[PDB]
Amino acid sequence: LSTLEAEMAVEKKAVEDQRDADLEARAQKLEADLAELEAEGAKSDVRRKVRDSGEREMRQLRDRAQRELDRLDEIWNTFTKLAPKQLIVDEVLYREL
């Protein structure tokens, strides 16, 4: 249980580091690309539509990564608390186990 808990946290951390690296890069792309639009023929409403599409895209990026974290925690919890008579209806989670 010690070695597996470690590996599981390392793998779970690798997803956290990957998420933080992508959201920062996407945010930088927003700053740089939004600066071009604000410095060149800028208008109030259009820039808001570009940043809204930027915020919405960033939201989806964090949601996806959080889904994997939720899936990972669902996998580690099921193994530690596992016992006979337990029923697994996911079938993809069972394949992962």
Side-chain angles (χ1 to χ4, degrees), residues 1-28 30-37 39-96:
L1 196 281
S2 62
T3 50
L4 302 177
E5 181 181 9
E7 300 172 341
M8 187 55 189
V10 176
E11 169 182 331
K12 193 189 305 178
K13 168 183 172 298
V15 178
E16 289 184 312
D17 295 340
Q18 237 279 184
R19 175 194 61 172
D20 297 326
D22 303 329
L23 258 175
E24 185 68 67
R26 173 66 172 94
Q28 294 189 20
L30 219 192
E31 276 191 355
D33 290 20
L34 201 171
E36 304 269 341
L37 316 184
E40 175 194 86
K43 197 258 296 181
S44 295
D45 193 317
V46 55
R47 292 188 309 277
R48 256 55 272 188
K49 291 197 173 188
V50 184
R51 168 165 273 270
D52 284 26
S53 299
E55 293 185 357
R56 207 101 76 184
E57 285 193 3
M58 294 194 303
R59 146 178 165 263
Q60 300 181 2
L61 240 181
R62 155 166 282 100
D63 280 333
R64 262 243 200 82
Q66 185 67 44
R67 289 204 297 108
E68 182 175 3
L69 294 178
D70 293 14
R71 297 189 301 96
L72 290 172
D73 265 327
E74 188 185 41
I75 301 170
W76 178 245
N77 280 10
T78 302
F79 173 86
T80 50
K81 297 158 53 63
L82 197 71
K85 284 202 232 301
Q86 255 169 280
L87 205 155
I88 308 176
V89 206
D90 191 84
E91 154 192 345
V92 7
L93 188 162
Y94 184 92
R95 197 59 62 201
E96 205 126 5

